[PDB]
Design a protein around this nucleic acid. Structure first.
Ligand SMILES: [K+]
Ligand SMILES: [K+]
Ligand SMILES: [K+]
Ligand SMILES: [K+]
Ligand SMILES: [K+]
Ligand SMILES: [K+]
Ligand SMILES: [K+]
Ligand SMILES: [K+]
Ligand SMILES: [K+]
Ligand SMILES: [K+]
Ligand SMILES: [K+]
Ligand SMILES: [Mg+2]
Ligand SMILES: [Mg+2]
Ligand SMILES: [Mg+2]
Ligand SMILES: [Mg+2]
Ligand SMILES: [Mg+2]
Ligand SMILES: [Mg+2]
Ligand SMILES: [Mg+2]
Ligand SMILES: [Mg+2]
Lengths: 170, 156, 217, 92, 176
RNA sequence: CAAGGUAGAGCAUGGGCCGGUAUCCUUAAGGAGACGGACGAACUGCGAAUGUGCUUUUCUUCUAUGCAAGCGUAGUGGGCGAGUUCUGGUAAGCAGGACUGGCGAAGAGGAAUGAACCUGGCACUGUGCUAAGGAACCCAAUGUCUGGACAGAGACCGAAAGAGGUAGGUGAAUAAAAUU
């Protein structure tokens, strides 16, 4: 599970509201504290305001509707840190929410490249129509052309030992 | 192995700064000193009489006695896990007036007014203490002029 | 003979240099640092290729000499004498020591074991860090695949990791190719052999004029 | 406010009798006298009584003697003087 | 207030609170003497002790030194009430006692019931020292359901020590 | 409010490596060079973090079941180890220093076993809860989801150098399915 938040904040010195600007940042994280942490990280690297001179005025959660659980196609732009350097790339996913899309990327890179979730950075999330799809993976499922049978058996009962003449699986 | 002369290990200490060689300036000689002032030691390598031992360089103490061209200053030091007072003789070319009491003296000047009024009108002074910086203040913000931030820099 | 390379690989000790304090040091094996067409103007050899370090260690003067011979022989046979310039960037200033001991040990009048153990000079090495340029080439743009293969042969003469990489720079200038052309046209560059000086609006006017009549265009 | 309250408490507790001290003498007339003072202390705050009770518990060497003239010298114009010890003659 | 402010396209952010709450999560027995002295000055002595501290620049530098041992943050009124009612107690000098009407009236001449105490503690800044130094440190249990990760990591890393901000109430509510 | 010259950064006095265009000096060689690259424990033009001292309770916070001059008298004066760093040595369970906690003089639960590692400091009983580490069976508590991986491999385990198989990223082409 992963959530989406938008954080707002200003600069202060020995006195208040020293600049009339307000800064904003949308972030995918698990909770508000991990959200606030990211806001501090970006401010210090793109500007030079350290925490002691900042104040957060607001944090809000962003939520969709999707009462019917309709399935949508999304494209995601990302980078991650390896032992060598920083690696950029783009991949496409299907799901019922932007957060559902984002949790699947994080799982993928951990599986394929052996990276902990805190070393992955999301740059952009975009919802796409059928003509926009670039890579091969999801297109068959998007064009609604897939059926398959079950490969995994399923247990009939919670009992550990059963009679030879009973039905065992599904 | 090392040696134990009076000026051991003073190659960095006891050397003049870049473009600051030569004898002291007139202000050094025209400064008047009094018993009870706080004073600060900084050795001038060009003057060879009245030099203190290099342990005392950069330390601050209190004037105990005043002579023609030298001063006696009181210091404290730890030896064999006990505190010992030490009385150091220094020539006036190797000392400067210390700034360490500056703020306290200003505060005393304010207290000296209040403590008189406190006998006439009140009974006890308000005494004007310092306080450490408190929590972050409250703010009311107009909310036009929003600036967005993003991980646009890819950092190849 | 010599001890194996593993004895002196890592940078354990502080730098130690030939000086009034350290005498009786032997000469390093490498003596020649530039090969090919040394004085060729900066414009004439645009492509730049480097061997780059992915390690922090010491390189012996014996290894540097072996690499020089290897890289040079290849370029000379393939590029021709007038088409390339090679530079070996690192100089072996650090002195290694040995605490020499007898084979017929156990009992002697000589002070045996770890008594009075400080060593005598043994040889020399260069000290190297991550991301440093160890060997550099400039050539014609036709000779990319040749220059790559020349530098590959050095990679087997040194301990640790090293990579062959191509540069953004024009020649042995420090300038990116795009920017170089933009300064060359518009008259701002003066040739100084393997590199360039940039003209600026800084001095007296009669000097500015005298510089500009000398520009590359 | 609080720093004063604290210090004024410490100063008081430094005067009062300890109540876990007892004189080492096996003299029953001396132990009688201590019992009286002890029962007075637990019903008063007066500093003179507390000082007297603490001094009856100290050793023979701690109860050092005084000569008559030195009492007068220290009496500082008072009429009654009190002393937990022995008063000796001054031949001078 | 929030209605009036939004109706004129403006945001209001209140002043930071006057006190933090601190809980001692892990054992101090091998820490340096400088750390041990700092814990003493905050009155923390055994694991799962909890204590209230003035928000101030001196306190914030003390916390920076001990942050690897303690969870800290800010506490809203509802949780402050559950703490004082379920685990509070007091002292005069060396006598430990239950919070009762007689004992309040004795110590603070104008506070007479336990509800007035909580009100002054939350809303009056200038009496905090007197009001705080009357309460003993709170003695809590370990949290019900345990800790989710290695508690010695920072909260950002998924452990239990550091600054939990507005969310310390969740840790304390499992420990009352 | 003082003092400091280490890490980084630099090569302006001193030591010191390689190559130089115009120009200059001679030769008809070489030399100098308006500059670039490479450097020092006993080179410095600049300079941290951490640590040290001074004043102020007229400055937060704690504090009496606490500190304690003075007097009398014991044992000790072979140490060893962890983390961070340093010197000598090819190194060493090697020899020798510095800083903050240990074992010595420290039990209990955990790393199968271990002086020093992780949790965490012990009077004597009873009921609850957690840590570190575990949860097919030995042995108190275990299952779920998504990717990889076929080697008598891995969970415990060695280098420079490499091809093969498979999973992904980025950049070049070509394209009458794609392919390199
Ligand atoms: K000697
Ligand atoms: K051998
Ligand atoms: K032997
Ligand atoms: K230099
Ligand atoms: K140095
Ligand atoms: K002895
Ligand atoms: K022993
Ligand atoms: K111990
Ligand atoms: K065991
Ligand atoms: K062992
Ligand atoms: K079982
Ligand atoms: Mg020294
Ligand atoms: Mg003389
Ligand atoms: Mg060494
Ligand atoms: Mg520990
Ligand atoms: Mg847990
Ligand atoms: Mg350095
Ligand atoms: Mg000995
Ligand atoms: Mg043990």
């Amino acid at each position: 599970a992963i959530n989406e938040y938008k954080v707002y904040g200003i600069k202060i010195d020995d006195n208040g509201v020293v600049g009339d600007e307000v800064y904003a940042h949308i972030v995918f994280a698990t909770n508000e504290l991990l959200a606030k942490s990211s806001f501090n990280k970006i401010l210090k690297k793109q500007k030079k305001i350290k925490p002691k001179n900042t104040k957060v005025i607001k944090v809000e959660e962003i939520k969709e509707d999707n009462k019917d659980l309709d399935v949508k196609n999304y494209g995601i732009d990302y980078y991650y840190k390896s032992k060598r350097c920083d690696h950029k790339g783009y991949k496409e996913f299907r799901g019922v929410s932007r957060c559902h899309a984002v949790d699947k990327l994080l799982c993928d890179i951990g599986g394929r490249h052996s990276v902990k979730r805190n070393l992955i950075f999301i740059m952009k999330v975009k919802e796409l129509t059928v003509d926009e799809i670039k890579k091969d993976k999801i297109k068959i499922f998007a064009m609604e052309d897939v059926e398959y049978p079950a490969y995994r058996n399923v247990l009939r009962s919670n009992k550990l030992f059963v009679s030879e003449n009973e039905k065992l699986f599904n | 192995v090392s040696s134990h002369g009076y000026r051991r290990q003073t190659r960095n200490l006891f050397s003049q700064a870049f473009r600051k060689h030569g004898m002291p300036n007139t202000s050094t000689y025209l400064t008047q000193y009094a018993v009870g002032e706080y004073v600060d030691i900084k050795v001038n390598p060009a003057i060879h009489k009245g030099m203190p031992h290099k342990y005392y360089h950069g330390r601050t103490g209190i004037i105990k006695e005043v002579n023609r061209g030298s001063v006696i200053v009181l210091f404290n030091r730890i030896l064999a896990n006990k505190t010992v007072e030490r009385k150091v003789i220094v020539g006036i070319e190797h000392i400067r007036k210390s700034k360490c009491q500056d703020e306290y003296l200003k505060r005393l000047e304010i207290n000296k007014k209040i403590i008189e009024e406190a006998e006439k009108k009140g009974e006890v002074p308000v005494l004007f203490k310092r306080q450490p910086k408190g929590p972050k203040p409250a703010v009311e913000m107009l909310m036009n002029n929003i600036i967005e931030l993003s991980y646009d820099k890819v950092e190849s | 003979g010599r001890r194996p390379g593993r004895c002196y690989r890592y940078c354990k000790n502080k730098p130690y240099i030939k000086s009034r304090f350290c005498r009786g040091v032997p000469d390093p094996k490498i003596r020649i640092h530039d090969l090919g067409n040394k004085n060729a103007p900066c414009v004439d050899l645009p492509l730049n290729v480097n061997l780059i370090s992915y390690s922090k260690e010491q390189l012996s003067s014996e290894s540097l000499e072996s690499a020089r011979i290897a890289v040079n022989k290849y370029m000379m046979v393939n590029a021709g004498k007038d088409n390339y310039h090679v530079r070996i960037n690192v100089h072996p200033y650090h002195i290694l020591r040995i605490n020499k001991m007898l084979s017929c040990a156990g009992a002697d009048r000589l002070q045996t074991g770890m008594r009075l153990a400080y060593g005598k000079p043994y040889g020399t090495a260069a000290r190297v860090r991550f991301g440093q340029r160890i060997i550099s080439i400039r050539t014609k743009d036709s000779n990319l695949k040749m220059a790559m293969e020349a530098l590959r042969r050095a990679r087997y003469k040194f301990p640790g990791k090293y990579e062959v990489q191509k540069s953004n720079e024009y020649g042995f200038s420090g300038i990116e190719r795009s920017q170089f052309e933009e300064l060359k046209n518009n008259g701002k560059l003066i040739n100084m052999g393997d590199h360039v000086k940039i003209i600026k609006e800084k001095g007296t006017v009669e000097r500015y004029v005298k510089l500009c009549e000398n520009a590359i265009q | 406010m609080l720093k004063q309250k604290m210090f004024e408490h410490y100063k008081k507790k430094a005067i009062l009798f300890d109540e876990s001290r007892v004189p080492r003498t096996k003299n029953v007339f001396y132990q009688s006298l201590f019992s009286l003072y002890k029962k007075v202390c637990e019903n008063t705050e007066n500093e003179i009584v507390h000082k007297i009770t603490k001094r009856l518990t100290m050793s023979r060497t701690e109860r050092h003697p005084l000569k008559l003239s030195n009492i007068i010298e220290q009496a500082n114009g008072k009429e009654i003087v009190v002393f937990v010890g022995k008063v000796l003659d001054d031949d001078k | 207030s929030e209605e009036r402010m939004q109706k004129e396209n403006k945001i209001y952010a209140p002043k930071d609170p006057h006190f933090y709450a601190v809980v001692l999560i892990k054992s101090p027995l091998r820490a340096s003497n400088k750390i041990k002295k700092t814990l003493e000055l905050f009155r923390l002595k055994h694991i799962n002790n909890c204590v209230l501290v003035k928000n101030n620049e001196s306190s914030r530098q003390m916390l920076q030194k001990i942050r690897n041992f303690v969870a800290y943050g800010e506490l809203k009124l509802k949780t402050l009430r559950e703490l004082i009612y379920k685990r509070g107690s007091c002292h005069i000098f060396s006598e430990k006692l239950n919070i009762t009407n007689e004992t309040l009236e004795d110590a603070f001449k104008n506070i007479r019931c336990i509800e007035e105490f909580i009100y002054e503690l939350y809303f009056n800044d200038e009496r905090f020292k007197e009001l705080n130094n009357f309460l003993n440190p709170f003695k809590l249990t370990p949290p019900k359901g345990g800790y989710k990760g290695r508690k010695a990591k920072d909260i950002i890393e998924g452990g239990a020590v550091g600054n939990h901000q507005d969310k310390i109430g969740e840790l304390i509510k499992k420990m009352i």
